[PDB]
Design an enzyme around this catalytic site. Structure first.
Site, short mmCIF file in Angstrom:
data_model
loop_
_atom_site.label_atom_id
_atom_site.label_comp_id
_atom_site.label_asym_id
_atom_site.label_seq_id
_atom_site.Cartn_x
_atom_site.Cartn_y
_atom_site.Cartn_z
N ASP A 1 19.04 18.86 4.45
CA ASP A 1 19.98 19.92 4.09
C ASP A 1 19.93 20.39 2.63
O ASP A 1 20.39 19.69 1.74
CB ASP A 1 21.40 19.48 4.48
N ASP B 1 19.79 27.64 2.52
CA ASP B 1 20.47 26.50 3.15
C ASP B 1 19.94 26.08 4.52
O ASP B 1 20.28 26.68 5.54
CB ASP B 1 21.96 26.84 3.20
C1 LIG Z 1 26.82 26.20 1.81
C2 LIG Z 1 27.56 25.01 2.42
C3 LIG Z 1 28.58 24.39 1.46
C4 LIG Z 1 28.23 25.40 3.74
C5 LIG Z 1 27.51 24.76 4.93
C6 LIG Z 1 27.79 25.46 6.27
N1 LIG Z 1 26.08 24.65 4.68
C7 LIG Z 1 25.79 23.34 4.69
N2 LIG Z 1 24.56 22.85 4.49
N3 LIG Z 1 26.85 22.54 4.93
C8 LIG Z 1 26.81 21.08 5.07
C9 LIG Z 1 26.69 20.70 6.53
C10 LIG Z 1 25.41 20.56 7.13
C11 LIG Z 1 25.30 20.20 8.51
C12 LIG Z 1 26.47 19.98 9.29
C13 LIG Z 1 26.34 19.60 10.75
N4 LIG Z 1 27.60 19.73 11.48
C14 LIG Z 1 28.08 20.97 11.73
O1 LIG Z 1 27.50 22.00 11.37
N5 LIG Z 1 29.26 20.98 12.40
C15 LIG Z 1 29.88 22.14 12.74
C16 LIG Z 1 30.08 22.47 14.11
C17 LIG Z 1 30.73 23.69 14.47
C18 LIG Z 1 31.20 24.57 13.45
C19 LIG Z 1 31.86 25.79 13.80
N6 LIG Z 1 32.39 26.78 14.08
C20 LIG Z 1 31.00 24.24 12.07
C21 LIG Z 1 30.35 23.02 11.72
C22 LIG Z 1 27.75 20.12 8.68
C23 LIG Z 1 27.86 20.48 7.31
C24 LIG Z 1 27.95 23.30 5.08
O2 LIG Z 1 29.10 22.93 5.31
#
Ligand SMILES: CC(C)C[C@@]1(C)NC(=N)N(Cc2ccc(CNC(=O)Nc3ccc(C#N)cc3)cc2)C1=O
EC number: 3.4.23.46
Length: 387
Positions: free
Chosen positions: A36, A229
């Site tokens: 990530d 990202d």
């Molecule tokens: C720019 C950043 C700060 C925002 C963001 C979106 N980008 C990221 N790399 N991360 C970290 C990240 C990476 C991977 C995950 C894996 N689980 C998820 O996705 N669950 C999920 C499921 C459904 C929804 C909806 N409706 C949202 C999230 C979670 C957070 C983030 O939170």
């Protein structure tokens, strides 16, 4: 290709994420870890969870060190901070002592069937939780070894649905740690400045849909920021830019009418096997600030990148996809579907991100993704957003 040991070390897909194998502890505990670039914490499941078939067991690690500090990360997962010895089997042959957040509680974090048990935050310490004093993994890697301060990602979308058995045996890409492997791209690498070291922030200075200028004040493209990202599936665009882009994409593809649910990225559209009308969909070009004053370059993606393959709710023989462009209230996000068209170089040492056409991007006989330059562009510094 000079980094064969790391080529093809990734598995996964845009929707569920791309992951790399890592080991934590002594003796080593093997875990699949989400790559990530949009976060900065190395965190692993450390307690039983319905979606995990394995997790980090600190009591079994002789090298485990407890930091006696909790960490709360709401997007949400909760964990306990500590350090331990970490390695990447298909990576640099080095072992480093790194911070590890042992996830003990999580809500909607782990993805059912993703096959990953932790997350590797490759961004900068400024966005690390609880705060910037928790040294990110890659920082520890560089400080403790001779590994060059640079990594590169080749994410490979298959262009079609991968079933549960296929996605486990399929190569999903490459994460080259400490270098650039030339077998992973064609053409030339073009570099855009990392604007500030927190997220991998860049500046977009022009947007085109089939060569047609979207014609918005360029600051709109970076409101409130633009980042690369891999932890996000879609190309996410600021509300107003999304509305204008979808209007243009609909206009270009007007020979076919698609339901509102499609454009909202919530419903799939299907075509008889092999008949997806790729040609009625426009290519999308993003111009990025170059390393030379008043100079920019562009990366161009195809609908083979922004239409994400999904298995028909009927498992039929139709080729089905979801529109992988959605609106953002947090700025532009170049997610995995965009990264799948390019070999992306995160050159931390030179504070720049490089783009080149990916040797594994999906295309057709008539169009290919592209990275082209240079272009005369004025006042690009004004495209950046300031709070
Ligand atoms: C720019 C950043 C700060 C925002 C963001 C979106 N980008 C990221 N790399 N991360 C970290 C990240 C990476 C991977 C995950 C894996 N689980 C998820 O996705 N669950 C999920 C499921 C459904 C929804 C909806 N409706 C949202 C999230 C979670 C957070 C983030 O939170």
């Amino acid at each position: 290709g000079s980094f064969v040991e790391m080529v093809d070390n990734l598995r996964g897909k845009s929707g569920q994420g791309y992951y790399v194998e890592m080991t934590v502890g002594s003796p080593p505990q093997t875990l699949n870890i989400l790559v990530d670039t949009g976060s900065s914490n190395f965190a692993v499941g450390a307690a039983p969870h319905p979606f995990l078939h394995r997790y980090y067991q600190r009591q079994l690690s002789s090298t485990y060190r407890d930091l006696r500090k909790g960490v709360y990360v709401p997007y949400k997962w909760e964990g306990e901070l500590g350090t331990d010895l970490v390695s990447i089997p298909h990576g640099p042959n080095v072992t480093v002592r790194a911070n590890i957040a042992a996830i003990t509680e999580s809500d909607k974090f782990f993805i059912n069937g993703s096959n990953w048990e932790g997350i590797l935050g490759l961004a900068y310490a400024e966005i690390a939780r609880p705060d910037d004093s928790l040294e990110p993994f890659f920082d520890s890697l560089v400080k403790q070894t001779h590994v060059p301060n640079l990594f590169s990602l080749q994410l490979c979308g298959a262009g079609f649905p991968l079933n549960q058995s296929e996605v486990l045996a399929s190569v999903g890409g490459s994460m080259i740690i400490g270098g650039i492997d030339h077998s992973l791209y064609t053409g030339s690498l073009w570099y855009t400045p990392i604007r500030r070291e927190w997220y991998y922030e860049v500046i977009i200075v022009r947007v085109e849909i089939n060569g047609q200028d979207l014609k918005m004040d360029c600051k709109e493209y970076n409101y409130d920021k633009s980042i690369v990202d891999s932890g996000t599936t879609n190309l996410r665009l600021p509300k107003k830019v999304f509305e204008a882009a979808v209007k243009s994409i609909k206009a270009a593809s007007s020979t076919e009418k698609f339901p509102d649910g499609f454009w909202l990225g919530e419903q799939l559209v299907c075509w008889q096997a092999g008949t997806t009308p790729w040609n009625i969909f426009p290519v999308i070009s993003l111009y990025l600030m170059g390393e030379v004053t008043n100079q920019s370059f562009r990366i161009t993606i195809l609908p083979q990148q922004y239409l994400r393959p999904v298995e028909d709710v009927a498992t039929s023989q139709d080729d089905c996809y979801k529109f992988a462009i959605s609106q953002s209230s947090t700025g532009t996000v170049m997610g995995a579907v965009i990264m799948e068209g390019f070999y992306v170089v995160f050159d931390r040492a030179r504070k720049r991100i490089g783009f080149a056409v990916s040797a594994c991007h999906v295309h057709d006989e008539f169009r290919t993704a592209a990275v082209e330059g240079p272009f005369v562009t004025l006042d690009m510094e004004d495209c950046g957003y300031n709070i």
